[PDB]
Design a protein around this ligand. Sequence first.
Ligand SMILES: Nc1ncnc2c1ncn2[C@@H]1O[C@H](COP(=O)(O)OP(=O)(O)OP(=O)(O)O)[C@@H](O)[C@H]1O
Ligand SMILES: Nc1ncnc2c1ncn2[C@@H]1O[C@H](COP(=O)(O)OP(=O)(O)OP(=O)(O)O)[C@@H](O)[C@H]1O
Ligand SMILES: Nc1ncnc2c1ncn2[C@@H]1O[C@H](COP(=O)(O)OP(=O)(O)OP(=O)(O)O)[C@@H](O)[C@H]1O
Ligand SMILES: [Mg+2]
Ligand SMILES: [Mg+2]
Ligand SMILES: [Mg+2]
Lengths: 90, 351, 332, 345
Amino acid sequence: KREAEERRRFPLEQRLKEHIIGQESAIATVGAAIRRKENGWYDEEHPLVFLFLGSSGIGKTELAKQTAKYMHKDAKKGFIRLDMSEFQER
Amino acid sequence: KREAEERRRFPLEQRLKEHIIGQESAIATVGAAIRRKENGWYDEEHPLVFLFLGSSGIGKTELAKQTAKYMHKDAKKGFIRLDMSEFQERHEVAKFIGSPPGYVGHEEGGQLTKKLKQCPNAVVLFDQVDKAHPDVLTIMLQLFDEGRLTDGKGKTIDCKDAIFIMTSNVASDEIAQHALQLRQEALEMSRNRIAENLGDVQISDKITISKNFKENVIRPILKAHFRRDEFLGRINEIVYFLPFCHSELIQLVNKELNFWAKRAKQRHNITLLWDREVADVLVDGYNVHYGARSIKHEVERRVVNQLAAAYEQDLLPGGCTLRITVEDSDKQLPKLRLEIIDKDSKTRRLD
Amino acid sequence: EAEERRRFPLEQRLKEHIIGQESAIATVGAAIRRKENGWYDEEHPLVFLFLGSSGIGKTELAKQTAKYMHKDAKKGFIRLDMSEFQERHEVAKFIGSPPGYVGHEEGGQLTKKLKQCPNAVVLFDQVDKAHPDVLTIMLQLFDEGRLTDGKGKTIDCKDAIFIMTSNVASDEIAQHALQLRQEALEMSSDKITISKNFKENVIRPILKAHFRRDEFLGRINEIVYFLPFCHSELIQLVNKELNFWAKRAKQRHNITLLWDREVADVLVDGYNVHYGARSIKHEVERRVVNQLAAAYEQDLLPGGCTLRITVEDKLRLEIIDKDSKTRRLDIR
Amino acid sequence: KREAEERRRFPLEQRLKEHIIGQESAIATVGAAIRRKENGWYDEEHPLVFLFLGSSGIGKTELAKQTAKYMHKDAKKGFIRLDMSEFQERHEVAKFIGSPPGYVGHEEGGQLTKKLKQCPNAVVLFDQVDKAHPDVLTIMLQLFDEGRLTDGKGKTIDCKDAIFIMTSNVASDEIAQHALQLRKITISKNFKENVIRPILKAHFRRDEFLGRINEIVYFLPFCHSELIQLVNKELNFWAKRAKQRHNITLLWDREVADVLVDGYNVHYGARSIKHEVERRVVNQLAAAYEQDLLPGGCTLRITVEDSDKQLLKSPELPSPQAEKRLPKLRLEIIDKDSKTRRLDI
Ligand SMILES: Nc1ncnc2c1ncn2[C@@H]1O[C@H](COP(=O)(O)OP(=O)(O)OP(=O)(O)O)[C@@H](O)[C@H]1O
Ligand SMILES: Nc1ncnc2c1ncn2[C@@H]1O[C@H](COP(=O)(O)OP(=O)(O)OP(=O)(O)O)[C@@H](O)[C@H]1O
Ligand SMILES: Nc1ncnc2c1ncn2[C@@H]1O[C@H](COP(=O)(O)OP(=O)(O)OP(=O)(O)O)[C@@H](O)[C@H]1O
Ligand SMILES: [Mg+2]
Ligand SMILES: [Mg+2]
Ligand SMILES: [Mg+2]
């Protein structure tokens, strides 16, 4: 019951702005969609599917890592990273 | 007898229509085939098999799911969902049937074999059947033709009265393009008939694909993709899924907003209302290359983010009434705003 | 004897000897209290299935329970390890050999142990590792408490208590507790509760994918879950291990040991989520006690002295004299 | 003459219905075969064979025990129970016959041989016959070839007047959903022919063994009204135990029976409903006595906690991360002033 009050105290838009500066539209979009998920006002029958198009080394992996760190205390188990460059063949 | 009276009263076609919208020819074809099977005289020597052709957003898999909801009360047991996406190689056919003697997993058997062994009358759905390897369709040949499947242990399973549904998405661009061309030609003809004062004939809203199109362009595309004419020959019904109309788009957005309002009323007891310009704006956020999924992921970026972002500010009490309106500053161009209506018909804007 | 059980309920003894698991201890205590009141069905023994991760305390809970019911564990505690019973023929270690064969006169091991004490608590430890056929052997032992030996003899154990510890559905409940670690700790008494529909909608597919028999799971009376350790439970575990070592030192050579509130944080920092209480146990055993043994060989610890564990501004052992002067110990 | 008079007065089906409920087709079938036995109009050269099939906790082995109790007053002497679970290997067949003359323990003989020598008319229950090796049952039909088994010492035993009941759990699934799809409700003959027969012939691997069986008996899982009747019978049993041990009278509502039938699993059988009765009613029912909150002669009623009633009356679909709380049964001492006194420990 205290989780909504904690997020009212420190929203993830401020946490992500502290971690990553710039691209506040991306921060606002991911924060709004995550807020819909974690509030419960979200269709559970489909997962939350983000696509990020960016330049090389702009902080997208850092953004997803900080999102997973905010969502889960353990980022070793609560976060999965996969490199699609290795998976060329079927 | 009582099941016959239930079928005569409420067929599956009304269940499909109240569950999913549009697709009247598709619902007619599938319900007709179920009508032939359930009437107690269908040929048990061959099972019913369907191939669905349509674009990305149109619910072919949703239609199959509601068909299996009709056919069996247990969706988890009587309905076997099976994705063809992970059957991308020839050795993936092992997962279809099992393993030969002397190999690992031979004692476990195969997945579709034992799942058809548990119930023979199952609705078996193959999602993305065009995206599997053709040598996996090769084993689907003798499954569809006579209803017999051979296990890895020598067991033969009769799926003789089963129903097989395949969902594929090849030739979707050509189907959508020709449907758009037919609809614009019919709209030009109907507008010319309106301007020439012909309104005494009931212009029914049903535009159908000819047999000549079905043989001339769709058939060589299917023959080039599936590369076996016997696989297309075993399929009993080929069912097409036409792209959504404008009134179908309106019906879809009201169905989704009614789902949201029903969820709010049965979870937090909040009533919400929409206007005609709001619905027109929500139809305007549609992508032609997709379908209902485009609406299903733009409503939350247009509407439900403003509902959820208002919800941590404690601005939505119990039993309150909300109305969504097009923005008066953005009526010229395009955003939506919540507006809580009090008992004295006064309106409050949510910041 | 109601006065003795009112003086010492088993929940007090269990919390005295094992920490955490406020729901599992209460569940086994309620079942044992139902046995103690004399209103259990006398035809059916008690069967428990423990679901918990590594190093949580299931085997220790069974050992402490059987220490309560029977004073001697050599007679009243029968523990069989299912790590032997990986094959189909290992069944013949329960019952005797068929007549005319090798070891037929040796008899059944479980029948002999149940004949020595029919009231004895039986622990089927690590029933994950058993063959599925051994499960069907002890099917009748859970159904009626009656087992037939190889000589035609038949033993009755209707009054006995059957405990099984398992590892099969240990991940998922932990994952469930993961959201509870983000809910019950953020609910701030406060408790960690496993939902009632979980045991029938998700756990039963793992139990059916592993044990494969409906009758085996139907014969088990109670399914007892074990939850992963929280932060305060890890604090209490660190203080319990340090108090065990301090009590051992005071019993052995009268050596007083002190740790502040700040010391336990760097010991909780040495913890694996995949491991359990044994990780904290041997981390305490390695980081602290090795310096104590090295000082005890070097005659640097006379009896009656007071020692303090201090975090570096390493866990340094500092002698505290009566004049409040810290003295570092130089260990070679 | 007295036996025919008591068979006319109290046939065994009424005693069965007093002891076990439901399964009236199975009760009628086994009872009719026993009526064929007890009037003397039965062929002695083929002793009566029952093959009981059902799910777990559906009513098989307790029915076999009640048949043993009806025929034999001394069940420990005149009723032989063999668990086919131990006979998972071929060499466990040596348990049946005893040793050859000289090998380790030879004069002991088979346990079946001695137990049928002591009573040739004893009812014999091979229970969980599906747990046995396929080799073992290929000995077993010789015990139905002429009703004779030969010991290693040559001590042949004649058991013409025996009743051979084998319980199993083969092919119980589609039998259970076939009984579910029909909601007297009995199994059809077509389902007995084209479903369970090839599975039985393939599992036993010797179809002459299926030739040896006189009657295949099919059990069906529980409907709602008989599940409530199980709740009433179990609370009657526990209240009767409280009367003959401490003089405690219990009262339970129809909402109480609805709550206890809400906690039921189909696959686990009546053992699941028995465990949830024991974990909820008996638990606080004895926790009150641990504090001596129930004096002798007191009268109690069972109520439900008020929170979960409004959840039960509204059947809404829950989320996979939702937590469903069980309705909690509370004890109330019902006073003579038409007043209730709750118990909170
Ligand atoms: N006509 C419709 N009426 C109602 N809902 C629909 C309709 N079309 C699509 N939907 C919704 O959008 C979803 C899209 O369909 P679904 O994901 O089941 O399969 P599909 O679109 O046939 O698949 P694919 O990606 O292979 O083309 C449905 O689950 C449903 O919620
Ligand atoms: N809750 C606990 N409180 C205190 N000490 C504990 C607790 N759990 C475990 N320990 C300690 O750690 C040891 C490890 O436990 P034990 O050997 O009984 O197996 P377990 O935790 O049940 O796991 P496994 O399934 O691997 O047997 C115990 O002997 C005990 O010393
Ligand atoms: N006819 C019945 N109706 C309801 N419950 C029953 C019935 N017979 C038995 N039970 C319950 O099920 C338990 C098991 O019964 P029993 O040992 O005779 O075997 P079963 O139910 O026929 O099947 P299984 O051998 O597969 O366990 C009994 O202890 C009793 O609680
Ligand atoms: Mg789909
Ligand atoms: Mg332990
Ligand atoms: Mg049985």
